[PDB]
Design a protein around this ligand. Structure first.
Ligand code: NA
Length: 106
């Protein structure tokens, strides 16, 4: 059915020189940014430190977070992408539109 409420998944990688406390704060900041722009946070995963397939700004590891959200704001994925792009601490960002049935929980 045609519907303007859409579901999205965002995955981003934080540079490994931030402290555990800074990484978790970054995640909360991304969530609050999404919440600002008319998005409801449905789900979230912390994937911890992961080896990168190939280096990024001379880094071989990074901190991965994942968040799913829903919104009627069609520009939120554009917005989030720009925000994660310009954030110097976020060295990788990926935005995926997902189905409603792909929303997870716990
Ligand atoms: Na960035």
């Amino acid at each position: 059915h045609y519907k303007t409420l859409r579901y999205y998944e965002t995955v981003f990688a934080v540079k490994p020189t931030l402290s555990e406390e800074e990484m978790k704060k970054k995640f909360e900041q991304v969530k609050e940014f999404i919440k600002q722009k008319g998005g409801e946070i449905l789900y979230e995963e912390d994937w911890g430190m992961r080896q990168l397939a190939y280096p990024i700004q001379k880094f071989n590891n990074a901190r991965y977070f994942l968040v799913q959200f829903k919104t009627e704001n069609p520009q939120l994925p554009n917005e989030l992408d720009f925000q994660l792009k310009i954030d110097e601490d976020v060295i990788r960002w990926l935005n995926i539109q997902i189905k409603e049935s792909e929303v997870k929980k716990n």
